[PDB]
Symmetry: C5
Subunit: 199 residues, 5 copies
């Protein structure tokens, strides 16, 4: 098998509309935000503009191939793959995807999709100009798949811009499972707490 064949097979059979559950277990999705920049804070309106890499991994066995005498990985357009329907609950703009929309697929079916995203959020900006800083919580999970279909789990300034007006003090993560009035089932989310301040 060469790359051409692998990409051909994936395109012909991938089923981007079909969540790749195994034996009625949820697809285990990992999410991890790598913050790159904080662009436009407003303590009055409690809105912040953030740029981050949304590192997202999950498994889709339907993509697997025998890697004997074959490449172990290919880059694939996400339009050819099932992708988790993650959304940020407290986003107040749609995600602006800054990078090429390609996912990396390993021969065993492991997928990594890691767009760089710019997005605005409604969160607690109070304290941003103090030494303790602000703590902005960003909430992410599947919009339409409950906990039996998708589980969501977590996996600081490492890639944060030195030229930002802000600095990151700490980043913490917490997993939740919430029942909403609209629906009987629970929906998982990750809450990423970004503790930052003006320099």
């Amino acid at each position: 098998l060469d790359r051409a064949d692998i990409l051909y097979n994936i395109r012909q059979t991938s089923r981007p509309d079909v969540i790749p559950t195994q034996r009625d277990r949820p697809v285990a999705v990992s999410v991890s935000l790598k913050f790159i920049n904080i662009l436009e804070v407003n303590e009055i309106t409690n809105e912040v503009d953030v740029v981050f890499w949304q590192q997202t991994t999950w498994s889709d066995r339907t993509l697997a191939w025998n890697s004997s005498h074959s490449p172990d990985q290919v880059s694939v357009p996400i339009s050819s793959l099932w992708v988790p329907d993650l959304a940020a609950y407290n986003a107040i703009s749609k995600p602006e995807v800054l990078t090429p929309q390609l996912a990396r697929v390993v021969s065993d079916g492991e997928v990594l999709y890691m767009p760089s995203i710019r997005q605005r959020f409604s969160c607690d900006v109070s304290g941003v100009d103090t030494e303790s800083g602000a703590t902005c919580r960003i909430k992410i999970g599947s919009w339409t798949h409950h906990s039996r279909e998708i589980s969501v789990d977590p996996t600081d300034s490492e890639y944060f811009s030195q030229y930002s007006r802000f600095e990151i003090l700490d980043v913490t993560q917490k997993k939740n499972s919430v029942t909403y009035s609209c629906c009987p089932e629970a929906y998982e989310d990750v809450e990423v707490s970004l503790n930052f301040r003006k320099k």
Copy 2:
């Protein structure tokens, strides 16, 4: 039947361009706005920027399948389903859909579509800085389907952001059936009255 089969059949036969009327009864659509945020009020211009979940439900039997030994529900891209042509009469911007455009379909054909929307409206902003607050009325209904084809019915701070500069005092709903100069038939709408104030 597995998910793949169900989604395949739906894609192959769905008829997104065909309103699923039963026995010449209107498609009964329920609409309900869950307000998430109020972002940019202007009492001078009487314009407001709102984020809300537009909970929308209706029935389409053409989607139904036998759920015996099969999943009871699937998430489906709305491009593969008929969707009611709802519009907000007093919107002054097009709806920015913030979430993945997926509907949830149950085996009996019940559909739930619940995008998170950011949109600007022209409405009464007077009194927003008083204790009584402003009452902003949002009017939603089918743009091209009259009351024999589509009926529209309703179904507060529960999901409203604590970080908003505003707070919700009350939300009320009212159903209407209006005849317009352009056409002989009546068109139904729901009017959602959002009573809110600056904190």
Copy 3:
């Protein structure tokens, strides 16, 4: 014939790229603006932001069907129909279509397309703050079809927002047939004069 059949036939045979002239007569298009809002006036720059329903009607016999024991009308995506190539000569932004892009088709081939549009225009804003008000003239006609192929004809505050900062005094319409330097034939337009003032 049911809706499914009618929409299937329309989709299979409609020819959205083909102007439905009959016997070498122009397609007679009617255009009528129902003003909904006036949002952002600037008497210095002579620019105005307007929301209006662009009521547009014409006939396309290729869409007709026998309505005996059949629905008399269907809603159809405009991407499946020929639509007149109307443009506003003095627009300075592209039309923001706020409503679902569906036209209503009657079994005899009458079409009604009535999007709600937000658009900015260059026009006479002088006097807007006086009692006489301003008169803003909006000019609309086929961009590429001359008078032998498309004719354009007209057909006040009825739907105008009570919450606008402005009010409508009067709306008048006038038909014209103009020869431009670019081309030998005449092109029809409708000029809609919107007389409005600050409240």
Copy 4:
């Protein structure tokens, strides 16, 4: 032949990706800007926002049909035609096309494409508030086709409600060689002399 036939044939055989050179001569493209409005001048940043009709004509024989007992012209979506890859070198925003994207095609293969465009440019805005006015120069030519493949040549509607007025418009053709490439690329430079009223 009726319109439906002509449009069908064009759709089936047009080859929008294929530049219609004849006998290895360049496609001769005419370009002409009809200025409609000047919207947002900034003398400090030297940026201007303009609306103009970009009158563009060229010939594509592969579109031709026998007009005997047939319509002489049809309107065609540009997605079904080859169109010259013109760009404005000093544009600092992408062209906002305000009109329906249709070209007019004559039975002999003459094409006219005339979108109304709003676009921002980096140009000389100095003197806009004087009697001499500013002269803003707009430079347009094929982005990827050199002079042997595309030649570009120049060949009333300005809004009375603009804050500006047009004193003069002049045009000049150029053939320039760039560091990136061995061949010459043609352009038209349109000089818009305008001032605040």
Copy 5:
């Protein structure tokens, strides 16, 4: 062969989703920014708005044809070609492509894609109003292809607008090969250092 045939073959067989590696060597991509304008500097936020031609070249032998009695080059929509997945790491807006999205392909499979791009960046704007000026560093590389699949290499005011409020003092380039926490492999990048200042 005429252009029609060449473009027809390319469209029918191009495989825009398939990186054209040769014998398991990386596709060697050259990148070079020709700066055209600097539009909106902010020394407080350290953000800059730049317009530049992103000269990008690489080889794709699957596009090659016999140029005997045939045109030596054609312009091709990039939607019909594989194109490197280059991204600017420090961009804070998506690239606004100002020009027609066509690449030039030579009969030997050499490709030149050279869009004009307007984009905002987070970079060091300090000193912009001084004689030394600011130095803004722009970092560009493949987003998803490591060094064994794509290598990235470099190739001043020449096309820079005389009407900008800024002027260019110097442009330097540096190639890097970086390993990120997310993945075991190294990813190459070019860092383009734009040294510029406000005029006056």
